[PDB]
RNA sequence: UUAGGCGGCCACAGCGGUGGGGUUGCCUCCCGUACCCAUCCCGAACACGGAAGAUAAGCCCACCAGCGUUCCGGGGAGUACUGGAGUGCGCGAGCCUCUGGGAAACCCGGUUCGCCGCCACC
RNA sequence: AGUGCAAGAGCAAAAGAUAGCUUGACAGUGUUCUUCCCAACGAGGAACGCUGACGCGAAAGCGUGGUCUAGCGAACCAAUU
RNA sequence: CCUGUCAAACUCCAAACUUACAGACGCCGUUUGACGCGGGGAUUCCGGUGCGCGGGGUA
């Protein structure tokens, strides 16, 4: 399972690429979604490769971001351990996190918005004109790499 | 053979066995084919249908297994062909086959030929087949009369030992008569 | 093995390549059976522009009709060698050609499952000279 | 295009590779299809008759009855519904 | 006319003589120079390598070749060496010589298309590289910057 | 399939070559023209009638790779080309990096001298 | 090679050649595609049927002119069936 | 036999890629009625630029 964050805007981006992000529930910059590692999903992320940051996050990081930026399908309600326990199959954020990571369920299945609306990266990211292997922030990241980004956008 | 661009004919065209232009036309009817084939000594008749991996023969008769019913004469003649046709035709009927189109392969549509005798036989067996009566022999020749008379110009038996000296178109009737009722494999 | 490997005469073609006939008559008597017209192909200067057009006749003789003919034709010829086919044929003379081959030739002349005669089973110039020379005359 | 006939720009699609040259096998010209079956359309360079407009080469339609020995195949050109009269010699069962 | 007009390979390949008439003859005199009777049985083999894809008019080929071979006469008219220009001017070139109306040009010449890194010239010499000099003069009359490369020759 | 008939795929099956096989299931060559039929001339062919002979053709069986073809390993080659991205480089032509694909020639070594279906048959 | 004529395509027991026979280059009426990709638009064209009458063939079958894509023309008026 | 080169109107080969249909996932629709059908009203038929691919042209 990979974490998807749009880092580049819609202006001037191919339409077929924009619709792809939209099918992955991201409609704004800094919006994140969690995607299972399947053939179907893999092709989609490859197509979006140049306007996004993605990678497999650590259990911890996912928990921090889930707690901090997860939302119900509808409403303000904070998604904390109690919420998770009183609304999902799991007993706490950690349990949900693990299930997501092991691709056993999805944010929607558990009554949560498929989108984690992140905050801009505190300290700024590495740039949206170059990929990771060049010092930029676009493309596939290290688990440590994704974690840094996700945590700076916590 | 000569290179990458060289065109090699379909196998059965190489073997000079199948006329594909005639085959297509034959298959147009959507009906089973009455395959009439000859050999120096025998005459074969098959009712073939189309299949996913090749033709399917649903019924057949060979001039050899004619003796199996009382044939004691040569098997490469007119009376032989007719009977083989009738025999295959009967087996055809038993198999639930009601109609067919005559496929004479690479043979020639010569009037009174053996392939047409085969066709006559199959039709009398009950098989409905597109035909033309005045392209068939005049019964007597089918019976084998032309050969009996030929032996009349004897001086030396037309048949080396075989059966009879003056031959028998009567043996023909006895057999046809036989095939038209009961008996095994029919 | 032999008997089915030994040569034999298959047709002798006597033809008079005239250029426009009355010649048939002699061909009929020299051979014994009707002659056949010889149409020509292509338009050419020898005032022979007509495509379909009688310009000679030929006669293909087989069996006895061929022997009974060669039993007078050969004697009227001397030549041999070099003037022989690579397939064991030879033409001399009014032309008189002799096509020679062995027993299983029908295999390449019939309609069903026809086939081209293997090089080995073909008749060589030499194996030809022998057969004929061994029939009322001499080679070279 | 410098002209607008049906065969304009069909040099490739209506030409056989040198080895597929020559009369095609009759088996596929007699194939029978049922209404509802999905068939791929592809003109066979060697078969003159039963063809359809070259623009439809590559389409995959639905057999929906027949006319004479030819079949009536329904396709969708862009957004438009069309019916194509075509013989078995130029059709293939999908899958 | 300047090479500026034809040195680039931005146009389609235009070489089909069955649809193009009035093509000027080539000015290139020979392609095999020196001892063409002998085969490359020499110790040293130097090559003139083009470093950029370009079009070289038959004009430049001839002047480049002449300037090189005419100089290789530091070895003599019947000297022991063989010189080869491996390219031929296949590309037909036009000129629109009315303004931009019906501008398809008329044939005015021919040029050879050389891709960066190909060798246009190859000389065969015994340890006597006067050829290295014949080429300093040759890449002097062709558009691109060039690399003088030696292959069989560890006799440095 | 101790040899047959109708085929499907239509060169992996072609081209060329070697060896083996028949008182019979057989196929052939073969023998022969009163008939049905036949040659713009010839029972050559086509058609019909038939077994004295033969396994030499064909055919069937076993096999050979020199040519052609099919597929595969290794090399060429992750090269050539290319869908997506870049305030990367270059006077420019053009190039480079990241991401997703990815060849052709040719060389060397294997494969391939058909596979499969229905029917008939010591 | 040939197949009337551009170019490209198709074709070998043929779509080519030869021979013989024949007039389907037929009347009537349609389905569909094309003309006009997608996407409306006439004449024209083609493909594929049917009804009727025929030709040839043992027969399956072929023949809705020429192997395929050019060779075409509204209303008003006249002549004609 | 050896040796030197090419093709918009060449091809023994042959991509990336575009494309018909189907299934799967995604997204979407069934009170926000999608897909589609029928009807009313238009405006519009001088376009331009960047990038990729081009054809013409010294540009
Ligand atoms: Cl037969
Ligand atoms: Cl159509
Ligand atoms: Mg909300
Ligand atoms: Mg700050
Ligand atoms: Mg920055
Ligand atoms: Mg043998
Ligand atoms: Mg036609
Ligand atoms: Mg007027
Ligand atoms: Mg009038
Ligand atoms: Mg395209
Ligand atoms: Na074909
Ligand atoms: Na002017
Ligand atoms: Na220079
Ligand atoms: Na005549
Ligand atoms: Na044999
Ligand atoms: Na119309």
What would your notes on this structure say?
Chain B: This is Large ribosomal subunit protein uL18. Chain B: Pfam families: Ribosomal_L5e. The structure is cut from a larger assembly and holds chains A (154 residues), B (186 residues), C (140 residues), D (95 residues) and E (156 residues). With 140 residues, chain C is an alpha+beta fold. Chain C has a single domain, classed as Ribosomal protein L5 (50s Ribosomal Protein L5, Chain: A, 2-Layer Sandwich), CATH 3.30.1440.10. Chain C is built from three helices and five strands. In chain C, strands 2-3-1-5-4 form a five-stranded antiparallel beta sheet, with helices on one face. Chain D has 95 residues and is an all-beta fold. Chain D has a five-stranded antiparallel beta sheet, with no helix packed on it. Chain D is 0% helix and 32% strand. Chain E has one domain: Ribosomal protein L16/L10 (Aldehyde Oxidoreductase, domain 3, Alpha-Beta Complex). Chain E has a five-stranded antiparallel beta sheet with strand order 1-4-7-2-8, with helices on one face. A three-stranded antiparallel beta sheet of chain E has the order 3-6-5. In chain E, helix 1 packs antiparallel against helix 2 (131-138). The relative contact order of chain E is 0.29. The chains are: A alpha+beta (154), B alpha+beta (186), C alpha+beta (140), D mainly beta (95), E alpha+beta (156). Chains in contact: B-C, B-D. Chains B and D meet through helix 2 of B and loops of D. The complex binds chloride ion (2 copies), magnesium ion (8 copies) and sodium ion (NA) (6 copies). One sodium ion is lined by residues 98, 101 of chain E. The structure holds three RNA strands.
Main interface by residue count: B-D, 15 and 10 residues
Write the CATH architecture name of chain D: Roll
| CATH top level label of chain E | Alpha Beta
Structurally, how many domains make up the residues of chain D?
Answer: 1
What are the key terms here?
part of a larger assembly; 5 chains; A: 154 residues; Ribosomal Protein L30, Chain: A; 3-methyladenine DNA Glycosylase II, Chain A, domain 3; 2 domains; 5-stranded mixed beta sheet; globular; B: 186 residues; alpha+beta; 4-stranded mixed beta sheet; 34% helix; binds chloride ion; binds magnesium ion; binds sodium ion; RNA-binding; ribosome; ribosome assembly
Compact overview of the structure:
This is part of a larger assembly, with chains A (154 residues), B (186 residues), C (140 residues), D (95 residues) and E (156 residues). By secondary structure, chain B is an alpha+beta fold. Chain B has 7 helices and 4 strands; from the N terminus they run ααβββαβαααα.
């Amino acid at each position: 399972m990979h974490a998807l964050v749009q880092l580049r805007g819609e202006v001037n981006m191919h339409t077929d690429i924009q619709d792809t992000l939209e099918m992955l529930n991201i409609h704004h910059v800094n919006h994140c979604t969690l995607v299972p590692e399947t053939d179907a999903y893999r092709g989609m992320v490859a197509k979006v490769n140049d306007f996004v940051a993605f990678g497999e996050p650590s259990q911890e990081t996912l928990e921090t971001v889930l707690a901090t930026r997860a939302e119900p399908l509808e409403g303000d309600a904070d998604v904390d351990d109690e919420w998770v326990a009183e609304h999902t199959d799991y007993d706490d954020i950690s349990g949900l996190a693990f299930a997501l990571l092991s691709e056993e369920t999805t944010l929607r299945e558990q009554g949560l918005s498929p989108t984690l609306r992140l905050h801009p990266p505190r300290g700024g990211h590495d740039g949206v004109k170059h990929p990771v292997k060049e010092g930029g922030q676009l493309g596939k990241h290290d688990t440590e790499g994704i974690d840094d980004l996700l945590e700076a956008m916590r | 053979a000569t290179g990458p661009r060289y065109k090699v004919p379909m196998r059965r065209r190489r073997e000079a066995r199948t006329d594909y232009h005639q085959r297509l036309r034959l298959l147009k009817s959507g009906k089973p084919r009455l395959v009439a084939r000859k050999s120096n000594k025998h005459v074969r008749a098959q009712l073939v249908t189309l299949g996913p991996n090749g033709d399917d023969t649903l019924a057949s008769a060979h001039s050899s297994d004619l003796a199996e019913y009382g044939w004691e004469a040569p098997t490469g003649n007119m009376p032989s062909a007719y009977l083989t046709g009738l025999l295959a035709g009967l087996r055809a009927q038993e198999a639930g086959v009601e109609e067919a189109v005559l496929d004479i392969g690479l043979n020639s549509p010569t009037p009174g030929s053996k392939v047409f005798a085969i066709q006559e036989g199959a039709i009398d067996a009950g098989l409905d087949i597109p035909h033309n009566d005045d392209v068939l022999a005049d019964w007597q020749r089918t019976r084998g009369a032309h050969i009996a008379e030929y032996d009349e110009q004897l001086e030396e038996p037309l048949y080396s030992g075989d059966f009879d000296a003056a031959d028998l178109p009567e043996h023909f009737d006895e057999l046809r008569e036989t095939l038209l009722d009961g008996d095994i494999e029919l | 093995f032999h008997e089915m490997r030994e040569p034999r005469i298959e047709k002798v073609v006597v033809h008079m390549g005239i250029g426009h006939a009355n010649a048939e008559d002699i061909l009929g008597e020299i051979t014994g059976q009707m002659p056949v017209r010889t149409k020509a192909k292509r338009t050419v200067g020898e005032f022979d522009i007509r495509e379909g057009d009688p310009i000679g006749a030929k006669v293909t003789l087989r069996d006895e009709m061929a022997e009974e003919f060669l039993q007078t034709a050969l004697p009227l010829a001397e030549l041999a060698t070099s003037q022989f086919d690579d397939t064991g044929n030879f033409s001399f003379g009014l032309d008189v050609t002799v096509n020679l081959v062995r027993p299983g030739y029908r295999v390449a002349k019939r309609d069903k499952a026809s086939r081209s005669i293997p090089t080995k089973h073909r008749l060589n110039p030499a194996d030809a000279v022998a057969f004929i020379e061994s029939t009322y005359d001499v080679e070279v | 295009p410098s002209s607008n006939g049906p065969l304009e720009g069909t040099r490739g699609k209506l030409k056989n590779k040198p080895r597929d040259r020559g009369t095609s096998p009759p088996q596929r010209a007699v194939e029978e299809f049922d209404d509802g079956e999905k068939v791929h359309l592809k003109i066979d360079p060697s078969v003159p008759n039963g063809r359809f407009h070259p623009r439809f080469d590559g389409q995959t339609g639905t057999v929906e009855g027949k006319q004479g020995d030819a079949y009536k195949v329904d396709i969708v050109d862009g957004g438009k519904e069309k019916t194509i009269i075509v013989t078995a010699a130029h059709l293939r069962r999908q899958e | 006319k300047p090479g500026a007009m034809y040195r680039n390979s931005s146009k389609p390949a235009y070489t089909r003589r069955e649809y193009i008439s009035g093509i000027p003859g080539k000015k290139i005199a020979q392609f095999d120079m020196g001892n063409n009777g002998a085969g490359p049985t020499y110790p040293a083999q130097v090559e003139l390598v083009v470093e950029k894809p370009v079009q070289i008019r038959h004009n430049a080929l001839e002047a480049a070749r002449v300037a090189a071979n005419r100089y290789v006469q530091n070895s003599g008219a019947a000297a022991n060496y063989k010189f080869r220009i491996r390219k031929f001017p296949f590309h037909v070139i036009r000129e629109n010589k009315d303004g931009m109306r019906a501008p398809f040009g008329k044939p005015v010449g021919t040029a050879a298309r050389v891709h960066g890194a190909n060798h246009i010239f190859i000389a065969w010499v015994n340890p006597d590289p006067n050829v290295e000099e014949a080429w300093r003069r040759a890449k002097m009359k062709v558009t691109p910057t060039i690399n003088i490369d030696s292959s069989p020759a560890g006799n440095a």
